């Protein structure tokens, strides 16, 4: 039954790489149990609009006094109390991910189970950077490909694009390839993206402007490949509209990017109905982020592998109890209920710069 | 010759209506001159997805450490600079703008010339919010036809927007007429803004949902009177996606919006070189942000009146030494280098919250 949020904690660590990445984190409490989860903005707008600094400020300033010491039926009755504010979906993401963990936990019931997943292991790949060279792109593919990962991902630009890929693909001509192009183009480039379309890609994510659908859809026609969006699409009616107008053929779908778990769901129907899968993509996340994308990622238009691998290449340490390890290119789901993994608090405590307390 | 950015000023004040606004500016100072702009994003995420904080921390974490102590050739040098990070328009346009202005002051130009304006004055219109019904509608309009407004806006809502137009049509045969329908209708409601057809509106303002086009786009092709869009054009890009697509005739043009003076004249062109007219849209600014509206309008392609009308109508004392005021419907551009207006120093600090300044 219905659900009482009492109290939030925001709490910001500051987690090493292996120079760092600051993880938000909100904390949701009631009814004797919490939710987590984790902000994938970052201090400075790159990857898209949203900073810390203005995400911490509407949640302390707008959106939690909206919820505190208020009672609700479910997730999505959270997200309707946050009002009309426009954007900030990053924002809204925190609060309603935290939501879905939290009402999980008060049923007892995993939270892929939830929003409809019934898969116990997801499929993964990796993403790689540009490398030096056709043969340094290839042996750290192929110490990739030895790790059973099931799809390998090359960023790209001009003028590395065909090279790392003809390379690769000489070496792989089996494995499931694509490519990031990083927003790094132009229609002028369809010639050069044409070049790519023998090697046999899933997909080119992302090629043109990341706001953009309509010169997608121009592009597409030019390629064979299929393109897949990323930043153009933040909500079911992108996708909708993306997908109607032919801009792409696949979508990346990031969770706190479309508002959170209910919209990631329409999202991902939208996408089914259209014929289109989804995948799942990453941002660095630790294993709170991390074990909500697994989650998410159980639902049956996830035809393609995620960008959520194994925990161990990111952090000598993770923020979570539970280790999320994939193995031979998939991850099992973390069993509990909500997300199924547990913040280490102690841990958690030497890496915090920053924490704050909500009530009503 | 070129220009060196030495310091900068964030000073944001709390300015009483004739309840409160609160105003950020920043001062950029060098060459023994200053430039001056107003940010337009508010304490929430209401009109688009910017807010004061985010904004704020953003000038004084990136912006200003990434110009301040460079010296630059002109205003776009300047904005190239800033280059990397993605949406932000508003807070790009406060550094943008203030540029325009110290740039202009360092040649001792007006600011609208150096832009290619070469107006005198500029053509104003009233924006009225909903009343009660017809008649107090329609006396309303009466009034501001007598002072001289060359265009009426009307601000309709599901229920009440065939009923104040017909009245004040019927009073008012040919006045340039519009209305604001402010994203409160959505495609199911085409039958109904048909019915504002046979009163000839000059346009709709956006209609439907604030980010979009494609659906405007739909709605243009079911009724006749053409629409006039505003949140959804950011971009000189998304001007012209957005007129080719038809998704609308005309585009409420507002400066900060689309990322300052630069962006805003190709907003301009791209309209132009569609026949498309512009307008100048207003958002409660000080008389920073007026005066550098007003220059904006003297540009060609403004065809249509705007919201910028006699400050003396919002603040009972303007933060400039300057009055803005129009008579008969034409607001005069204010003499002097680059806005030609002054900051009332003295004034400015009785309603200060808070300043800092920046330098190397
Ligand atoms: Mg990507
Ligand atoms: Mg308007």
């Given amino acids: 039954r219905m659900f009482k949020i009492e109290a939030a904690e925001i709490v910001v660590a500051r987690l090493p790489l292996k120079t760092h990445k600051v993880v938000p984190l909100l904390i949701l409490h009631g009814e004797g149990v919490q939710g987590v989860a984790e902000g994938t903005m970052e201090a400075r707008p790159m990857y898209r609009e949203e900073t810390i600094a203005g995400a911490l400020d509407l949640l302390r300033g707008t959106f939690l006094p909206a919820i505190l010491g208020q009672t609700f039926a479910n997730p999505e009755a959270v997200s309707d109390a946050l009002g009309s504010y426009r954007g900030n979906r990053m924002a809204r993401a925190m609060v309603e991910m935290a939501a879905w963990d939290l009402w999980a936990r008060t049923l007892g019931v995993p939270l892929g189970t939830l929003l409809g997943g019934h898969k116990e292991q997801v499929e993964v790949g990796v993403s790689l950077g540009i490398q030096a060279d056709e043969q340094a792109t290839v042996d750290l593919v192929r110490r ?38 990083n927003s790094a183009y132009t229609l002028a480039d369809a010639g050069r993206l044409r070049q790519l379309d ?163």
Same sequence: chains 1, 2.
Avoid at 153 to 173: C, H, M, N
Wanted: charged residues 25%; hydrophobic residues 40%; contains cysteine.
């Fill in 144 to 181: 990739h490909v030895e790790q059973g990962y099931r799809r390998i991902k090359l960023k790209i630009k001009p003028g590395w694009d065909v090279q790392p890929v003809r390379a690769t693909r000489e070496a792989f001509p089996d494995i499931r390839l694509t490519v990031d192009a």
């Fill in 198 to 360: 023998e090697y046999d890609l899933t997909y080119i994510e992302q090629p043109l402007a990341w706001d953009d659908l309509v010169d997608h859809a121009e592009l597409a026609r030019r390629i064979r490949t299929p393109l897949c969006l990323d930043e153009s699409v933040a909500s079911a009616s992108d996708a909708r509209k993306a997908l109607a107008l032919g801009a792409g053929g696949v979508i990346n779908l990031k969770v706190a990017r479309v508002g959170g778990h209910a919209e990631s769901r329409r999202v991902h129907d939208v996408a089914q109905s259209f014929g289109a899968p989804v995948w799942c993509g990453g941002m660095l996340e630790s294993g709170i982020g991390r074990a909500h994308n697994i989650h998410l990622s159980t639902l049956s238009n996830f035809r393609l592998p995620g960008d959520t691998s194994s925990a161990s290449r990111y952090w000598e340490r993770d923020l979570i109890q539970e280790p999320l390890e994939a193995v031979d290119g998939l991850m099992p789901v973390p069993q509990g209920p909500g997300t199924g993994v547990t913040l280490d608090r102690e841990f958690l405590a030497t890496v915090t710069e920053a924490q704050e307390e909500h009530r009503a």
